[PDB]
Symmetry: none
Subunit: 99 residues, 10 copies
Amino acid sequence: MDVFMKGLSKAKEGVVAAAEKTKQGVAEAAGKTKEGVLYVGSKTKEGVVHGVATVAEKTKEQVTNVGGAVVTGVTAVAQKTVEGAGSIAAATGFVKKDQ
Amino acid sequence: MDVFMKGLSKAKEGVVAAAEKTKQGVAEAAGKTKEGVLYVGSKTKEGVVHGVATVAEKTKEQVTNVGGAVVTGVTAVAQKTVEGAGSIAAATGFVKKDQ
Amino acid sequence: MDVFMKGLSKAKEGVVAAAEKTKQGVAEAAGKTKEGVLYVGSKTKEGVVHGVATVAEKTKEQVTNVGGAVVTGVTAVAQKTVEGAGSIAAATGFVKKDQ
Amino acid sequence: MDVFMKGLSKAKEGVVAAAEKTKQGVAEAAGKTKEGVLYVGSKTKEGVVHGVATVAEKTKEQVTNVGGAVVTGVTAVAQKTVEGAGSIAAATGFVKKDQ
Amino acid sequence: MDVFMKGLSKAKEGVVAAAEKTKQGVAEAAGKTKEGVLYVGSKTKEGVVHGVATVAEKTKEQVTNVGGAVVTGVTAVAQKTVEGAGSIAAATGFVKKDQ
Amino acid sequence: MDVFMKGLSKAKEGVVAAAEKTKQGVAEAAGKTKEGVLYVGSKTKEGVVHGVATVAEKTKEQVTNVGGAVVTGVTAVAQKTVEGAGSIAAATGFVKKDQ
Amino acid sequence: MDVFMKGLSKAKEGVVAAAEKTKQGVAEAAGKTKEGVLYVGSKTKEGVVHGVATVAEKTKEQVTNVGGAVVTGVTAVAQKTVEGAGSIAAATGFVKKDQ
Amino acid sequence: MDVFMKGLSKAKEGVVAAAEKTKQGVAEAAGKTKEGVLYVGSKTKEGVVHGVATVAEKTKEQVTNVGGAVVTGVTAVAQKTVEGAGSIAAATGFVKKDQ
Amino acid sequence: MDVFMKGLSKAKEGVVAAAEKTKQGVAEAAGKTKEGVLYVGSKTKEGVVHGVATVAEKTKEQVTNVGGAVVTGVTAVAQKTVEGAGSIAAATGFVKKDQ
Amino acid sequence: MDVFMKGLSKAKEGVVAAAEKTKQGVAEAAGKTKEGVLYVGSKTKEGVVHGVATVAEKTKEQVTNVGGAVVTGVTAVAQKTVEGAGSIAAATGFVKKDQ
C-alpha cells in the first residue's frame, strides 16, 4: 500500500533516476531594474540609466552627440554544447542482465 | 493498492527515469524593467533609460545627434548544441535482457 | 506501507540517483538595480548610472559627446561544454548483472 | 512502514546518490545595486555610478567627452568545461554483479 | 518503521553518497552596492562611484574627458574545467560484487 | 493765449480751490490674497487660510468641529462723520466784496 | 501766454489752494498675502495661515475642535470725525474785501 | 509767458497753499506676507502662521483644541478726529483787505 | 518767463505755504513677513510664526490646546486728534491788509 | 526768467513756508521679518517665532497647552494729539500789513 512519487516499488534490480531543475550546459542572463520591490507610502524620485544620458532640470542649450556605438542589453549564448562523441545525460537509467 | 505518480510498481528489472525542468544546452535571456513590484500609496517619479537619452525640464535648445549605432535588446542564441555522434539524454531508460 | 518520494522500495540490487538544482557547465549572469527591496514611508531621490551620464539641475550649456563605444549589459556564454568523448552525467544509474 | 524521501528501503546491494544544488564547472556573476534592502521612514539622496558620470547642481557649462571605451556590465562565461575523455558526474550510481 | 531522508535502510552492501551545495570548479563573482541593509528613520546623502566621476554642487564650468578606457563590472569565467581523462565526481557510488 | 487746466485767468479777486483724491472721514479696508503678482515658469504649491483649516494628504480619519464662531472678512464703517454744526469742506472758495 | 495747471494768472488779490491725496480723519487697513511679487522659474511650496490650522502629510487621525471664537480679518472704522462746531478744510480759499 | 503748476502769477496780495499727501488724524494699518518680493530660480518651502497652527509631516494622531479666542487681523480706527470748535486745515488760504 | 511749480511769481505781499507728506496726528502700523526681498537661485526652508505653533516632522501624537486667547495682528488708532479750540494746520496762508 | 520750485519770486513782503515729510504727533510702528534682503545661491533653513512655538523633528508625543494669553502684534496709537487751545502748524505763513 505504498504511496510514492518519482520512485519505484516492488520490482527487482530496479533503477531510479530523478533530475529536477538540473541545468547542464546552459547560459542564463537577466537584467532587471526592479524585482521583488515593495513601496508603501513612499515618495521616490528615481532614475536608472543604461547607456548614455544627459539629464538636467533647467538649461539653455543641451546636446548629446553619439559618434560611436552604444551597445546595451541582455545576451545569453550557447554556441556549442556537445562536440564529437559522448553525451550529456540527466536522469538516465538501465538494467542489462545479459549473458 | 499503491497510489503513485511518476513511478512504477510491481514489475521486475524496472527502470524509472524522471526529469522535471531539466535544462540542457539552453540559452536564456531576460530584461525586465519591473518584476514582482508592489506600489501601495506611493508617489514615484521614475525613469529607466536603455540607450541614449537627453532629458530636461526647462530648456531653450535641445539636440541629440546619433551618428553611430545604438544597439539595445534581449538576445539568446543556441547556435549549435550537438555536433557529430553522441546525444543529450533526459529521462532515458532501458532494460536489455538479451543473451 | 511505505510512503516515499524520489526513492525506491522493495527491489533487489537497486540504484537511486537524484539530482536537484544540479548545475553543470553553466554560465549565469544577473544585473539588477533592485531586488528584495522594501520602502515604507521613505522619500528617496535616487539615481543609478550604468554607462556615461551628464546630470545637472541648473545649467546654461550641457554637452555629452561620445566618440567611442559605451558597452553595457548582462552577458552569459556557454561556448563549449563538451568536447570529444566523455559525458556530463547527473542522476544516472545502472544495474548490469551479466555473466 | 518506512516514510523516506530521496532514499531507498529493503533491496540488496543498493546504492543511493543524491546531489542538491551541486555546482560543477559553473560561472556565476551578479551585479546588484540593492538586495535585501529595507527603508522605513528614511529620506535618502543616493546615487550609484558604474562608468563615467558628470554630476552638478548649479553650473554654467557642462561637457563630458568620451573618446575611448566605457565597458560596464555583468559577464559570465563557461567557454569549455570538458575536453577529451572523462566525465563530470553528479549523483551517479551503479551495481554490476557480473561474473 | 524508519523515517529517513537522503539515506538508505535494510539492504546489504549499501552505499550512500550525498552532496549538498558542493561546488567544484566554479567561479563566482558578485558586486553589490547594498545587501541586507536596513534604514529606520535615517536621512542619508550617499554616493557610490565605480569608474570616473566628476561631482560638484556649484560650478561655472565642468568637463570630463575620457580619452582611454573605463572598464567596470562583474565577471566570472570557467574557461576550462576538465582536460583529458579523469572526472569531477560528486555524490557517486557503486557496488561491484563480481568474480 | 493761456492754456490752463484747473485754474483761472484774467479776473480780479479770484480764488482757485482744487482737491484731487482728497479723502476726509473715510474708512478703507482691503484684504487681497494676491495683488500685482507675476509668475513666469514657476511651479508653486501654495495655500492661504483665513479661518479654521484641517489639511492632510494621507489620513484615516479627519474631523473638524466648530462649536463657536469663525468670523472672517473685510469690513469698513463710516458711522458719524459730522455731528452738530461745522462742515467738512474740500475745494471751497468765495469772494464776498460787500460793504 | 501762460500755460499753467492748478493755478491762477493775472487777477488781483488771488488765492490758490490745492490739495492732492490729502487724507484727513481717515482710517485705512489692508491685509495682503502677496503684493508686487515676481516669480521667475521658482518652485515654491508655500502656505499662509490666518487663524487656526492643522496641517499634516501622513496621519491616521486628525481633529480640530474650535470651542471658542476665531476672529480674522481687515477692519477700518471712521466713527466720529467731526463733533460740534469747527470744520475739516482741504483746499479752501477766500477773498473778503469788505468795508 | 510763465509755465507754472500749483502756483500763481501776476496778481497782488496773493496766497498759495498746496498740500500733497498731507495726512492729518489718520490711522493706517497694513499686514502683508509679501511685498516687493522677487524669486528667480529659487526653490523655497515656506510657511507663515498668524494664529494657532499644528504642523507635522508624519503623524499618527493630531488634535488642535481651541477653547478660547484666536483674534487675528489688520485694524485701523479714526474715532474722534475733531471735537468742539477748531479745525483741521490743509492748503487753506485767504486775503481779507477790509477796513 | 518764469517756469515754477508750487510757487508764486509777480504779486505783492505774497504768501507761499507748501506741505508734502506732512503727517500730523497720525498712527501707522505695519507687519510684513517680507518686503524688498530678492531670491536668486536660493533653496530656503523658511517658517514664520505669529502666535502659537506646534511643528514636527515625524511624530506619533500631536496636541495643541489653547484654553486662553491668542491675539495677533496689526492695529493703528487715531482716537482724539483735536479737542476743544485750536487747529492742526498744514500749508495755511493769509494776507490781511485791513485798517 | 526764474525757474523755481516751492518758492516765490518778485513780490514784496513775501513769506515762504515749506514742510516736507514733517511728522508731528505721530505714532509709527513696524514689525518686519525681512526687509531689503537679497539671497544669491544660498541654502538657508530659517525660522522666526513671535509667540509660543514647539518645534521638533522626530518625536513620539508633542503637546502645547496655552492656558493664558499670547498677545503678539504691531500697534500704534495717536490718542490725543491736541487738547484745548493752541495748534500744530506745519508750513504756515502770513502777512498782516494792517494799521
